[PDB]
Amino acid sequence: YDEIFTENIKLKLQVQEYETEIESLEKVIDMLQKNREASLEVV
């Protein structure tokens, strides 16, 4: 029906916000562990 097309909208969008939440948690993890070790480097 049309309601099945409606979910085919918000979930088509709700994917594209996770996909950039998932990204942003890599962006910290990457820049985070090399910040922990940067302490010891400046220690």
Binding site: T6, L13, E23, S24, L25, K27, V28, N35, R36, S39
Partner: protein, 120 residues
């Protein structure tokens, strides 16, 4: 009350201003959280009792500012990682963290009760 500073010029005319909008952005956001919940208390209420070519673009407009919000949230939450790290670095044990934290939340409750002294 935790701000120190005495002259420094127009910067105190800036930093005591930016603290306002911070202690006031959480006001608009929590007094909007108390609003949004009630919609569900009316939405869930309904069950026991439009246009598709623009339903998307009235949510894509809300989806986009949720891409920038999430991205902004994370790069900032990592801005607190190092700077809390360097504090737990430059300090060592009994956290000055939780003190200034439980100090600031205390002003709020005063600032949430003293305002009521002036409501009465």
């Amino acid at each position: 009350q935790p701000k120190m500073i005495t002259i420094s010029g127009e910067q105190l005319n800036l930093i005591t201003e930016n603290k306002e909008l911070m202690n006031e952005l959480t006001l608009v956001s929590t007094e909007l959280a108390e609003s949004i919940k009630r919609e569900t208390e009316l939405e869930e209420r309904i069950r026991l009792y439009f246009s598709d070519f623009e339903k998307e673009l009235r949510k894509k407009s809300s989806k986009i500012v949720q891409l920038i919000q999430q991205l902004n949230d994370e790069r900032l939450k990592r801005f607190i990682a190092e700077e809390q790290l360097l504090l737990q670095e430059n300090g060592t044990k009994p956290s000055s963290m939780e003190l200034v934290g439980r100090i600031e939340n205390l002003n709020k409750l005063i600032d949430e009760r003293d305002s009521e002294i002036e409501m009465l």
